[PDB]
Amino acid sequence: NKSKVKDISLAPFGKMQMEISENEMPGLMRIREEYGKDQPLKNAKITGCLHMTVECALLIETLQKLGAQIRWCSCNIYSTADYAAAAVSTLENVTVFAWKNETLEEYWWCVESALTWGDGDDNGPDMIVDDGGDATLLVHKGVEYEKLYEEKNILPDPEKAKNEEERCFLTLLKNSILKNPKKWTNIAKKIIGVSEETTTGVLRLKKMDKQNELLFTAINVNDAVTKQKYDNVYGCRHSLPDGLMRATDFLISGKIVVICGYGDVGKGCASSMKGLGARVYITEIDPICAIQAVMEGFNVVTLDEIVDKGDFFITCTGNVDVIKLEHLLKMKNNAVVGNIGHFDDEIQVNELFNYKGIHIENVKPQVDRITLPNGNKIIVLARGRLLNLGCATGHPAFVMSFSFCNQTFAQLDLWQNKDTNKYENKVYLLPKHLDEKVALYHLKKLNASLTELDDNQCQFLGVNKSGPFKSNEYRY
Amino acid sequence: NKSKVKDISLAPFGKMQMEISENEMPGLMRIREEYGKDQPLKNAKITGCLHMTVECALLIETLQKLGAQIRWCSCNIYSTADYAAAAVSTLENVTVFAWKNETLEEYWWCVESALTWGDGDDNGPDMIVDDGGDATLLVHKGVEYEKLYEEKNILPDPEKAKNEEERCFLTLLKNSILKNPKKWTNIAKKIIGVSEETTTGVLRLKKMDKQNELLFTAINVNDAVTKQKYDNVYGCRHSLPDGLMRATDFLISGKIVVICGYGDVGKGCASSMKGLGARVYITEIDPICAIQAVMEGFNVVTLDEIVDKGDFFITCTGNVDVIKLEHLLKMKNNAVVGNIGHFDDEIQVNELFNYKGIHIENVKPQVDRITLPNGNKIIVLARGRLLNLGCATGHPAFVMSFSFCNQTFAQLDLWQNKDTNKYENKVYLLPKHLDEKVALYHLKKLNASLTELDDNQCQFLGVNKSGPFKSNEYRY
Amino acid sequence: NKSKVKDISLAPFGKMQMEISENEMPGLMRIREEYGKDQPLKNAKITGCLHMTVECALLIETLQKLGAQIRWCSCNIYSTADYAAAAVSTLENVTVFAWKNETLEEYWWCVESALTWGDGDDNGPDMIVDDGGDATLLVHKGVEYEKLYEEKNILPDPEKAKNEEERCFLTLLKNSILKNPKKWTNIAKKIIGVSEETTTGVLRLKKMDKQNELLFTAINVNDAVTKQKYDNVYGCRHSLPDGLMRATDFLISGKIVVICGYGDVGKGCASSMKGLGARVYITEIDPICAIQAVMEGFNVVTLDEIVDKGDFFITCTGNVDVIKLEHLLKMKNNAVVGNIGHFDDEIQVNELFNYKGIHIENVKPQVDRITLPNGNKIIVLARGRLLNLGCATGHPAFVMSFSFCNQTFAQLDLWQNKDTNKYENKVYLLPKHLDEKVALYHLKKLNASLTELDDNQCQFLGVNKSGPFKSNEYRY
Amino acid sequence: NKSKVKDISLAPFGKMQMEISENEMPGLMRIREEYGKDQPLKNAKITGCLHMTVECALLIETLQKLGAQIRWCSCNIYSTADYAAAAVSTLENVTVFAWKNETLEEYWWCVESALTWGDGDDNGPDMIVDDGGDATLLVHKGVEYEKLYEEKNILPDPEKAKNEEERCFLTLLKNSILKNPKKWTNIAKKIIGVSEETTTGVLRLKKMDKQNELLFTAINVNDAVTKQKYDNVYGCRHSLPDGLMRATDFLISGKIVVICGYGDVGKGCASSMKGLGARVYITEIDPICAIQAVMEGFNVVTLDEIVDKGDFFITCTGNVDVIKLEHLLKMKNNAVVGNIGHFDDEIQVNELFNYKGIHIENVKPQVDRITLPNGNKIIVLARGRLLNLGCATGHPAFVMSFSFCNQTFAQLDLWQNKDTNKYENKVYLLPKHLDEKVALYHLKKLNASLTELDDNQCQFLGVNKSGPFKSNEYRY
Ligand SMILES: NC(=O)c1ccc[n+]([C@@H]2O[C@H](COP(=O)([O-])OP(=O)(O)OC[C@H]3O[C@@H](n4cnc5c(N)ncnc54)[C@H](O)[C@@H]3O)[C@@H](O)[C@H]2O)c1
Ligand SMILES: NC(=O)c1ccc[n+]([C@@H]2O[C@H](COP(=O)([O-])OP(=O)(O)OC[C@H]3O[C@@H](n4cnc5c(N)ncnc54)[C@H](O)[C@@H]3O)[C@@H](O)[C@H]2O)c1
Ligand SMILES: NC(=O)c1ccc[n+]([C@@H]2O[C@H](COP(=O)([O-])OP(=O)(O)OC[C@H]3O[C@@H](n4cnc5c(N)ncnc54)[C@H](O)[C@@H]3O)[C@@H](O)[C@H]2O)c1
């Protein structure tokens, strides 16, 4: 029950950061004021697997101030802010397993430790807060392999590891089963539900739900309007250049920036690059998104067409093998490559790092310089992992306030309906009125005056004076 | 049946414009190349009620080249381009009833004439293309009043006219029933379906469908992605400043522009005003839209807060009484007021024009100068009706190509399934693949290179290499 | 001697436009309020040669309200607004010779008529307001050729006409000398001075002054901060897209726009195209301007590199042969070509129009469609002349207010120092304090609150609390 | 000959940064390739007083590679990058006295140490590179007080210290004179000249030159086009948000940002804030700049009008007392205040820090939180000193390349003309051709293709095919 952090003496620095960011998160603060003295999450055991940053610390503190017990780990080996981990590990009923620059082996250990609440009966959490689906994955795969072992006596061999991170994952599961072949099966049965924060995690849930593999309720927090339209757009508009500037200090204006993918994240990234004066190039597979990109003055092309002159290459597709080895080998000298989508699959950093005749030179934390066979030296950020969270501090508190408000409401609704049959083992979405509520909490801070709908106006539009004001199909 | 247009000698000028805009509508031209020699709409009787512009002429030509017969009218008394009406009235199997500056009495006469195909059995059309729902309204109200007369022997009295335009509407219906009390009831029975082009028309359809008043199938073309995301946004970004410039020639940069409503149209309008250097103020009733407005650098306020210093006031709410008489009376000298939403309800132009001590002075077509009681002189555009179509030429052909492609596909699908039970008396949406198809047709013209999804990438995303690439809930 | 205009019955329409634009020119209106009842220009004879637009009419009215007599003509054969010419010709002591679509022969006739005040002694004006230097040219060339005839008995032969417009010019001078070989020599002697409005006219004056050919004082109004920084930038940002929209109605967003020249005009043009969503490409010869263009996100290339995919080609160089015949022949179908710089030298429209196998088809006034040898049809605006003034109404009133305020001050200072030796036969610039004065007059209209410099702040900066606040070398 | 730096072990980290930034400074690298093996600065003793950053390290290395000996110090107590100082102190013939977070006493010690080359005859440098004029100040004041002491036997008393930093300055001078009352007088006599980098330093030089106090030649590097138009604009566009983000991590979009001053720096700052989506408010004393601000969509107001709702307050005036104590006391909770202009005079941080009832709490390096009397807690950056260099890393290498190229050329020209009478004790500027030269060096890196002027075009414009292309009065 002892937290594991880099250095507990950073707690005060983290505490100061939390106190300040409090004014930047009017949404979360409003939640504490309403459901505060009520303690609606009293006795609830919540395990979280989300970037251990300052904004995340304020989410933890909100959940615990709501009366819940928490075990937490980071969902990325570089996103953890040590001062935030130390500060949060100080709270009562909160245990944390996270630190910056953790190895892949240590990463899975933290996820497992966060999901394990002691031993024996009720060894798992009541609810899960995931960001990418790693905690959810471990549970589902654990249950899957435990059944395979109880039938064919077969264990997950890290031999068939199609990746280094997968090797540690399979190793963790193999050792887990050899210690207690029913651990995950018993835990999964007590889980009320999970709430997914990102597009990638939702994609995983949808595929499991499609094949009826979901063991418990899953709430799609990422598809909430006040999340995908704010977090994914305005957040990346902020943290992309921030991560690029801290990592390289290079000029962006007048430079050729290549953005792969023009969905929510791509739109946000491109907007900030355009405002700085960069020459934006977009790659896309979806014709609808491509036209949106062209209408903003961007040039839509295939990577092969611009890979030779590109100064910055940012992937925001949430797909795999977007920037292949053959592309990296053709880049100009001093080209910068980073991924802001998911894991490290978008860019074949591994293939490049293990290529014959490649020299890897570390410039600073999360920043490496690779010497290509032809002599060109390119820059790779966070070894292909989230550059905004690895080279910077991720989204600003004000943006994360929207996301964490939806997360909190997801946990509240899941816990308050645990004794009902409102939720099955499927993916659900938060109601429309909650989205408007979250938005309403941030209006004052923004000095935005909302107009009151009149009686005639209400009848004409066919809506209530309090909302919702749009239909469920509205795209905003 | 003979066409009724201003001057048929303008046909040549219109013909030249159509030939040129042909290159700007690759979408429509692609349709002619595929379903051309097939004549899928052969023997179909289509009645249209949409702005009679050059872009609309190319839509008519496409429908007739597909084998259909057409009767058409404009949906606005100022939007008709006489040279386009003359040109289209020239085509075989096409009859037109439209001209610029038509009176309200003449307007309804045109709608009725367009919907009436001869006399006796089968006196109505097979399908309807509407833009605002006026044709659809006439038919539904006609059936409603015809039943009221067949039961209580009561006729629609233009006495209870809550408006001048409504007076002519009720007068037209009263006369219609005194001539044939079953005209509309019999016509509504043969209508396969209608396809709505704008947000206002869809709102009308949704309300009727909510109360189960729909007499036939209705396709929501406005809610199609390649329409609400392109037409409503990029179209207005183009035609708002164009309408403002031609009507007043005033400088926009440095001026205080007040935009009411920040939905699709509002976002498009604000983007162009921002690009020109204006100081944009936004009014909103929806908190979610309000935050989007603030995140773009716009100040969100209530009209009462800025009505005194505003230089331009543009309504894009699609609501009623947004700019009341009390607001107009407080505006500065030379302030410009225009509506780009629906009809003339957004702004109380009528209340102002009939106010005691008000002097109305016509400056030029669709532009009037009003002298307020305090002596201030303000400028009102198109008497509160669509300023972009009244003072300019509406959206450009390239944008209308997306909308008209969805319209054509809507007519095609509706006609090809007339003998099936695919569509009931409800509001439907065109399939996802069609939206991507439409987008694909315009990529070449835009020099946009789409990327081909790989085999691994397809399985990972769980989509087909040809699309759709997004889920039905995707907001783009 | 009466005015010569297209149709005097348009006077009322023009009057209405002048009354409204009055609120858009707080600068000129302030001048009338200060030097109004004083009549400082009483008895002064002013000849003007500037675009006869509504904004220009308000300048004429201001000069006459100051007590001067005026004879005016347009400096371009397409820029005249007939309703403005009719309205201004109505004023007392104002004679106008201008109309839209005048032939080159008629053009010079108007210039000569405007410069000729009766007959005999004092046959010329006291001061001149030029825009391009045509009136100034005629006087200088007239004096030059009159001396050549009085010595070698040689006359200007229109045979050596290196251009059609030059032929009419030499023809006019030849006839002028065969009627009175001392007309211009005597007129030039009574001219107090001239004030140049545009960059091109200033270039002409500087070359004459360099070779000591100036016969009278010339004031460089164009190099005035509140002119080149406002008019050339913000004015073009407004009239470029307006001219393009009225002439073609084509979509600009997503289109490839090629701007040649990135000086004051180019910067303004590009800013508007960028705001609309176009993909901007810039051509430059000056490396300093080229970097400015790149830092704004624009791609700097040579015409040859983009002439194949360009949708719009706009020249703003003020140079000759920027877009040669070889370039025009390689343009895509439906490509638009227009000049916004000087005369019709920037684009080789003449070479193209007289090329073998070329078909010219008039679409509408100032808009022609040319069929290239390969079949491609391109659009040419105003036959290579100012597209913003030919296809639209030029800069808005508010922007012209700054230029015309500097013009009025130039005329006032020139007339008030006619009996002094403050000005020689050289090019002078208006003092710094006047530039700030002009700017100050427009602040209230813009709701801009200026800050008052404090006592300590004044000493520190070493400036007066009233200005100037910058040094003469400041670039703003 | 012993450098004084924080930790010499950071040398390798600094070296890696220098090697990378080399590719971002094609201008400086070109200088090394041309005047490299020539060693034009051989035996020259250069003392610099400029922000000891990585970009500065590359400038030092260039000067030494040119054959010069260097002694260097920082011109700000927070701008020094320790890893850069350590790396540069490694070079041969280079001595450095600088470190981050130095006290004011230590600051002047470094300046003095940098200007002192040994002892006895020739105890000073041959040339000086200044940024703010502190080194130049020390020398001029030193000579002034040395004469005052040699006449009235009066010493500079730190009693009359109108500031803490001035106290240390006068103390340094007093001790200097009590040790050798002719030190500075003798040194000033051997100084060939100095080259000023910033607007503030130039203002100081101009005031001395105006009163004939200049002891040696001064080159105004800041007024060079490729410096004020690139560095001051594009550099701040980059380092303003960067400093803001690293110091607070606060969201900028949708926030109210108040920029005081709209000159070169203000224009750059506002452009980046606008691109991020902030609501920009500008304060100005100059009417011309105010109109430029309004034409970009910004609201011009007096501080008193917005000081209550502002979220960020940035001063770019280069003036004194812009944000007084009475303004700071009225700011909202969590408001951020920072100066990017000169020293710490723009904002009365001192008055606030010494105000009764004020609590100062350090959040992190260069970031303090002040509790106001009414309880509001505001954030002050770098205690009123350059926030971009104190909270971040200043301008990016590519921008600094333009500035340092002009510096190098300034040193080269000054040293090559030391035995001539080309330069007097006045302020001079670099020739136009050099500005274009510097620009040309960076075109390739930017993928910008310059167009070659044609023979006819050259004669028409009256310029050489190689430039200059503009007149000295051109404002760009
Ligand atoms: N780092 C952060 O702070 C942050 C914040 C939110 C989301 N994310 C992550 O960002 C990624 C994308 O998120 P999103 O919400 O924008 O989802 P999205 O589905 O809206 O956007 C993905 C886009 O990529 C395009 N695409 C797919 N494969 C492509 C390929 N090979 N080449 C070019 N384009 C391709 C699609 O057409 C689509 O428009 C996910 O991995 C998500 O979880 C990161
Ligand atoms: N003239 C054109 O070319 C054109 C093109 C497309 C749509 N339109 C019309 O524009 C209108 C709006 O269209 P939209 O598609 O943007 O729909 P929308 O529903 O997406 O946008 C309307 C917005 O106005 C807001 N709103 C409603 N009442 C308001 C009030 N009283 N004050 C302030 N804001 C209010 C809503 O919250 C919403 O965000 C409709 O009338 C539609 O038919 C015109
Ligand atoms: N139509 C209008 O409303 C309006 C308003 C103001 C000025 N103008 C005219 O516009 C022209 C330019 O004006 P400006 O004030 O911007 O002057 P400018 O001197 O500031 O700009 C000219 C620019 O063109 C560039 N250039 C020259 N030849 C070139 C070539 N062959 N290719 C590419 N670039 C080239 C120069 O390097 C320079 O940057 C003049 O003709 C002027 O009279 C028209």
Side-chain angles (χ1 to χ4, degrees), chain D residues 221-237:
Chain D
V221 173
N222 182 264
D223 286 10
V225 186
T226 59
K227 197 284 169 183
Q228 74 174 198
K229 285 293 182 168
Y230 295 173
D231 178 304
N232 298 205
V233 180
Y234 308 126
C236 295
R237 170 191 296 179

Side-chain angles (χ1 to χ4, degrees), chain D residues 261-275:
Chain D
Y262 197 68
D264 293 309
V265 177
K267 281 181 174 68
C269 293
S271 69
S272 72
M273 298 295 98
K274 180 183 183 180

Side-chain angles (χ1 to χ4, degrees), chain D residues 88-122:
Chain D
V88 73
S89 70
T90 270
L91 290 304
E92 309 279 353
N93 304 313
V94 178
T95 306
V96 176
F97 308 96
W99 61 88
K100 195 180 185 64
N101 292 299
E102 28 179 276
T103 71
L104 292 176
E105 189 192 313
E106 303 175 312
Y107 174 74
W108 288 111
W109 181 82
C110 291
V111 176
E112 182 180 45
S113 298
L115 286 162
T116 303
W117 294 70
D119 55 1
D121 307 297
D122 298 64

Side-chain angles (χ1 to χ4, degrees), chain D residues 38-46 66-68 122 125-128 189-194 216-217 219 409-425 428:
Chain D
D38 190 299
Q39 301 284 289
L41 295 180
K42 195 67 193 305
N43 301 313
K45 298 194 293 175
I46 300 176
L66 289 183
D122 298 64
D126 292 306
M127 305 182 288
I128 295 169
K189 291 200 287 286
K190 306 297 173 55
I191 293 174
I192 305 297
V194 63
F216 42 76
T217 303
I219 295 182
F409 281 140
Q411 293 293 292
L412 265 302
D413 205 62
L414 221 49
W415 176 261
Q416 273 162 43
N417 290 295
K418 66 174 177 294
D419 289 348
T420 72
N421 53 186
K422 175 184 183 180
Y423 291 127
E424 295 177 290
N425 291 7
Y428 298 81

Side-chain angles (χ1 to χ4, degrees), chain C residues 161-230:
Chain C
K162 303 167 297 177
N163 174 50
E164 214 302 74
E165 186 248 54
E166 185 178 59
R167 176 190 175 67
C168 290
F169 180 71
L170 294 167
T171 299
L172 172 95
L173 283 178
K174 180 182 187 179
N175 289 170
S176 173
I177 298 166
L178 293 175
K179 178 184 296 76
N180 177 7
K182 289 300 172 183
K183 178 180 179 179
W184 305 110
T185 295
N186 290 157
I187 280 175
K189 294 200 285 285
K190 306 298 171 57
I191 294 173
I192 306 295
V194 62
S195 52
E196 238 323 296
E197 173 90 5
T198 207
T199 312
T200 283
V202 177
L203 191 279
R204 275 174 164 181
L205 288 179
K206 287 179 176 181
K207 289 194 292 192
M208 290 190 273
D209 180 36
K210 191 180 294 186
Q211 296 187 299
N212 297 298
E213 292 178 358
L214 277 185
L215 300 175
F216 43 76
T217 303
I219 294 185
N220 186 345
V221 174
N222 180 269
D223 284 8
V225 185
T226 57
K227 197 289 175 181
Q228 75 176 194
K229 284 293 184 169
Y230 296 172

Side-chain angles (χ1 to χ4, degrees), chain B residues 13 16-17 19-21 23-24 55 83 234-235 237-239 241-242 245-256 271-272 275-277 279 309 311 332-334 361-365 369 377 379 392-399 445-448, chain C residues 13 16-17 19-21 23-24 55 83 234-235 237-239 241-242 245-256 271-272 275-277 279 309 311 332-334 361-365 369 377 379 392-399 445-448:
Chain B
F13 181 83
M16 173 65 83
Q17 287 297 300
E19 179 176 356
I20 298 175
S21 300
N23 304 114
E24 291 294 302
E55 293 70 34
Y83 50 84
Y234 308 128
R237 170 192 293 181
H238 178 99
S239 54
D242 184 26
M245 291 182 252
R246 300 191 200 200
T248 71
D249 280 304
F250 289 175
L251 177 71
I252 293 173
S253 303
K255 298 292 184 57
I256 293 179
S271 69
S272 70
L276 290 177
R279 282 174 288 174
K309 322 210 305 296
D311 297 299
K332 74 197 283 178
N333 188 264
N334 219 47
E361 209 173 0
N362 179 268
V363 173
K364 73 166 75 168
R369 192 172 63 152
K377 300 181 180 299
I379 295 181
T393 65
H395 300 351
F398 195 90
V399 165
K445 178 76 186 309
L446 297 165
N447 298 291
Chain C
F13 180 85
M16 176 65 84
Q17 288 297 298
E19 178 176 357
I20 298 173
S21 294
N23 304 116
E24 291 295 297
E55 294 69 36
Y83 51 81
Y234 310 130
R237 170 195 292 179
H238 178 98
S239 55
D242 184 24
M245 291 183 253
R246 302 192 198 198
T248 72
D249 281 305
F250 289 175
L251 178 70
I252 295 173
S253 305
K255 299 290 185 61
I256 292 177
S271 69
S272 69
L276 289 178
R279 283 174 285 176
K309 322 209 304 298
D311 297 299
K332 72 199 284 182
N333 186 266
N334 219 48
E361 208 174 1
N362 179 270
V363 175
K364 71 167 76 168
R369 193 171 64 152
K377 301 182 181 298
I379 294 180
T393 66
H395 299 354
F398 195 90
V399 167
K445 177 76 185 309
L446 297 166
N447 298 291

Side-chain angles (χ1 to χ4, degrees), chain A residues 116-305:
Chain A
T116 304
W117 292 70
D119 55 1
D121 306 297
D122 297 63
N123 197 39
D126 290 307
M127 307 182 287
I128 297 171
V129 177
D130 225 340
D131 186 310
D134 270 354
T136 304
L137 178 67
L138 182 58
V139 181
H140 281 78
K141 278 290 174 294
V143 171
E144 192 168 70
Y145 280 104
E146 278 175 359
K147 172 156 291 299
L148 207 292
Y149 180 73
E150 193 217 13
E151 294 171 353
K152 323 300 172 56
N153 233 64
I154 297 177
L155 292 169
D157 66 312
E159 325 291 58
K160 60 180 180 179
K162 304 167 296 176
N163 173 49
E164 216 300 74
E165 185 249 53
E166 184 178 59
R167 178 191 173 66
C168 293
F169 179 72
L170 293 169
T171 298
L172 174 95
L173 282 178
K174 180 184 185 179
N175 291 167
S176 172
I177 296 167
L178 293 178
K179 178 184 299 73
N180 178 7
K182 289 300 173 184
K183 179 181 184 178
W184 305 111
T185 297
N186 289 154
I187 280 176
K189 294 200 284 286
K190 305 297 173 58
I191 294 176
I192 306 295
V194 61
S195 52
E196 236 324 297
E197 172 91 4
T198 207
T199 310
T200 281
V202 176
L203 193 277
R204 277 174 162 180
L205 290 176
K206 286 179 176 181
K207 289 192 293 192
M208 288 189 270
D209 179 38
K210 191 180 293 186
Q211 296 186 300
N212 297 299
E213 293 178 357
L214 274 184
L215 300 173
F216 41 75
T217 306
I219 295 185
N220 183 349
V221 174
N222 184 265
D223 287 11
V225 186
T226 58
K227 196 285 173 180
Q228 74 175 199
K229 285 293 182 165
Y230 297 174
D231 178 303
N232 300 207
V233 179
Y234 307 129
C236 293
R237 170 190 295 176
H238 179 98
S239 55
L240 167 65
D242 186 27
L244 252 33
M245 295 182 253
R246 299 193 199 200
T248 70
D249 282 304
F250 291 174
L251 176 69
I252 294 171
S253 308
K255 296 293 185 58
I256 292 173
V257 178
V258 185
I259 307 295
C260 303
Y262 195 71
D264 292 308
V265 175
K267 284 184 173 68
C269 289
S271 70
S272 72
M273 297 296 104
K274 181 184 183 182
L276 290 177
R279 285 175 284 175
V280 187
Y281 283 74
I282 303 291
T283 69
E284 251 299 335
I285 57 161
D286 183 336
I288 297 172
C289 292
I291 292 174
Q292 292 185 114
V294 177
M295 296 305 272
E296 287 310 299
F298 301 147
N299 186 6
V300 176
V301 301
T302 56
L303 199 55
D304 308 289
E305 296 176 287

Side-chain angles (χ1 to χ4, degrees), chain C residues 51 198-201 222 227-228 231-232 235-236 239 260-267 283-286 289 315-322 339-343 346 386-389 394-395, chain D residues 451-454 457 461 469-470 474:
Chain C
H51 304 288
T198 207
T199 312
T200 283
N222 180 269
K227 197 289 175 181
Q228 75 176 194
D231 178 307
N232 301 204
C236 295
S239 55
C260 303
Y262 198 67
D264 289 311
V265 175
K267 284 182 174 62
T283 70
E284 249 306 331
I285 57 161
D286 182 339
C289 294
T315 53
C316 332
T317 71
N319 206 340
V320 294
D321 296 328
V322 179
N339 172 44
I340 201 167
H342 77 129
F343 311 117
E346 298 214 35
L386 303 189
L387 76 92
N388 61 148
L389 281 153
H395 299 354
Chain D
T451 293
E452 266 280 2
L453 213 50
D454 200 58
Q457 292 173 155
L461 292 177
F469 302 106
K470 304 291 188 300
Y474 198 70

